[PDB]
From a paper:
Lysine-specific demethylase 1 (LSD1) is a H3K4 and H3K9 demethylase essential for myeloid cell differentiation, reactivating key immune checkpoint regulators, producing cytotoxic T cell chemokines, and preventing IL6 silencing in LPS-tolerant macrophages. The LSD1-CoREST complex has been shown to promote demethylation of nucleosomal histone 3 lysine 4 (H3K4) and histone 3 lysine 9 (H3K9).
The inhibitor-bound structures were superimposed and compared with the native LSD1 structure to examine whether these inhibitors resulted in any other observable structural changes. Therefore, phenelzine may play a dual role by disrupting the LSD1-CoREST complex and potentially its stability and activity, while GSK can only bind the FAD domain. Phenelzine treatment abrogated co-localization of LSD1 and CoREST or SNAIL and CoREST as indicated by a strong negative PCC score in the phenelzine-treated samples. Phenelzine also reduced LSD1 nuclear enzymatic activity.
Author numbering: 173 to 461, 475 to 782, 792 to 830
Write the structure that this text describes.
Amino acid sequence: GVEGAAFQSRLPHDRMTSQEAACFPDIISGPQQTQKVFLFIRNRTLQLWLDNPKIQLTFEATLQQLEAPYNSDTVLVHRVHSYLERHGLINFGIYKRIKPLPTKKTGKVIIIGSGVSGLAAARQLQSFGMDVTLLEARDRVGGRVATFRKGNYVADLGAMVVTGLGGNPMAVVSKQVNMELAKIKQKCPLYEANGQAVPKEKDEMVEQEFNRLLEATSYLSHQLDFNVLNNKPVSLGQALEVVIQLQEKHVKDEQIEHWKKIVKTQEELKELLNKMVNLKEKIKELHQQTAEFLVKSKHRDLTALCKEYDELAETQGKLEEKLQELEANPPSDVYLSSRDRQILDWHFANLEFANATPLSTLSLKHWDQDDDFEFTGSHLTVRNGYSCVPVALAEGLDIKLNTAVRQVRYTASGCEVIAVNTRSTSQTFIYKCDAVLCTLPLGVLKQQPPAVQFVPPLPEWKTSAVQRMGFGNLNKVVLCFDRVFWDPSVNLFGHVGSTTASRGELFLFWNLYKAPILLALVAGEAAGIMENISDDVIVGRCLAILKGIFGSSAVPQPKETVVSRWRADPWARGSYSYVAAGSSGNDYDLMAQPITPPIPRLFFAGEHTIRNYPATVHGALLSGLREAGRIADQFL
Ligand SMILES: Cc1cc2c(cc1C)N(CCc1ccccc1)[C@H]1C(=O)NC(=O)N=C1N2C[C@@H](O)[C@@H](O)[C@H](O)COP(=O)(O)OP(=O)(O)OC[C@H]1O[C@@H](n2cnc3c(N)ncnc32)[C@H](O)[C@@H]1O
C-alpha cells in the first residue's frame, strides 16, 4: 500500500535515508517506535501526493487525510511535510495550488538555460516564495528535449524514451501533463548491407556471443583489475578487442591440436604400412619355400606369419577408421566470419547509441556505474512529443528567450551575470541577483574557447572534472512519408553496416509513431562525422538502405525530412555525458558541488551532475529539484 509509494519516490520503505537523519536527528537518536511512525507518515504523505499529483498536497489536507493514530501529532506531520516539500518529493512538476503563491518574494535568482533541469528548479523555487528568472539562449524551451512538429508529423530529435515508470518522477510528470506513453516492442530484426534479413539462428547466436563478450570485460575489470595498463586507463573497446583476440586464439589452438592429432595418426599409418610390406615380402618368400616334417614345419610357420599380418591388418582397419572420423569432425575454422563480425558490429553500434560515444572512450570499470539505479518496467516512447513536458513546465515562469549568457560574476556581495540578445549580439543585458544556478550542458562548459567566462575563474577541481568527464554525441534523421511501407508490428529494425569503422551509420530504425514517420539513428564515430554532410544525401543513403530492405518499388521519396546535428549545435555541443576512461562516478558529484568565494552562490544542475541518473531527462529533473531544495534551504 504505502510501501509502493515509498518505492515510487526512490526511497527505502522501512528505513530512513541519510538526509532524513540530518534533518531529523531527534528521531535517529531516539526510540525505534517514533522512527517507525515517522516512516509511516512519510510514506502516507507520499501516497497521498502520488495518488492525486494534479493538485498541491498541503499540510492541512495531509493532516485531514491521515488516519486515526497519526493525525494528532500535528507538529511531526508538519515537519515531515516540510521536509518532503523542500526536496521536491511532493508538490513538484505542474500542479494546481490551493492558495496562489505569495505576492512578495524573498530572494532573486537567475537560472542559466531552460532545460528540464532549469524548468524544474525554477518551478520549485517559484512555489517556494522566491523571485526566479531564466536565461535561455535558444528560441524555444526544453533544450535537448526537441520535438519537430509540422502538420500531422511529430518527431523527437532529442529526448524520446521514458526508461521505465518504477521510481521515475517522469511518471508523475506524464500523469500531470496527460502525455500518452506507448510500449516499445522489443523485437528488432536485422538486415545486412545487401538487404537480406539476418536469419534467426545467426541473429541470436551473435547476440549471445556479444553478451558473453560484455560479461567477460566486466569480469576482467571487476575481478582482475584490468583497469590501468601501461599507465593508461583501459577503455571498453580495449577490453572487447582483447577478449575477441583471446577467443580467436582458442579457435586457432583447437585447430592446431586437431592438425597435430591427424598428422600423428598419419605417421603411425605410414610406418605401419612399411611394417606391412616388410611382412608381406617375408610371407611371400617363405611361401616360395623327413622332408614331410619340413613341409609341415614350413606351413606351421606360414600360418603364424599370416595371422600376424591379419592382426596388424585389423589394427590398420581401426586406424584408418580413426583417421576418417577425425577428417569428418574438425573444430571451427574462424571464430567470427566476416558477416558474423558485421552483425557483432551492429550490436556494438547499439551499445554506442546507448552511451552516445565510441566504446574506445568508455571507462571499462565505470561506464555502467548507474546500472544499479535503473527503473523497473518497460521502456515507453511518447506520441504527443516530449516537448509537451518542458513547454507545460514553462507556463507561468519568467523566461527570457534568445539571451545567451557570456559572463558570470560571483562575489560575496552578490552575483552579476552578463547576457546578450542572440538575434544580433550587439544589444546587451545585465542581471544582478543573490544566486545563480547554471544548467549549461557539459559540452558548453567544455568549449575550446570558453563561451561563458566565470569571474573569479572556476576552481581547479571544477574545471578538471569538466575536462575529465566525457560528453558524447548521437544524431537522428526523421523521414515523413505519405504511405507506410514497413511492418507496423515492429517498432525497431536494424541495418548492419559493411565496415566496423562505420557500424553506427543509420544502424537502427524506429517506427514508434503510427503516423507514417521513420526515425534512423546515427551513433558512434559516425555521429560526429556525418554532421559534415548535407541533409539531402543522408536521406539518399537512408532511402538506399530502405530500398535494399523493401525494394525500389515500394518506397516513395519522403515528403518531409529533418536531421539533427547535436555536436554542431552551439547550445548543446553533443548529446549527453558519458563516463570517460579517466573519469569516475565521483566526477558527477564534483559537478554537483556549489562554489563560494562566506556562503555559496554559484550552484550547478543538469544531466551531468546527478550521479545515479545521468544521461537522462529524469536525472535532469531530479537535479533541478535537488539544487532548488538546497538553494531554498540556504537562503530561507
Ligand atoms: C541529445 C539527446 C538527448 C537524449 C536522448 C537523445 C538525444 C539525441 N535520449 C534519447 C535516446 C536515449 C534512450 C535511452 C537512454 C538515453 C537516451 C533521451 C532519452 O530517451 N531519455 C532521456 O531521458 N534522455 C535523453 N536524452 C538526454 C537529454 O534529453 C537529457 O539529459 C536532458 O535533456 C538534459 O537536460 P538539461 O540538463 O536541462 O540540459 P538542457 O540542454 O536540456 O538544458 C540546457 C539549456 O541551456 C541552454 N543554453 C546553452 N548555452 C546557453 C547559454 N550560453 N546561455 C543560456 N542558455 C544556454 C540550452 O539552450 C538548453 O536549453
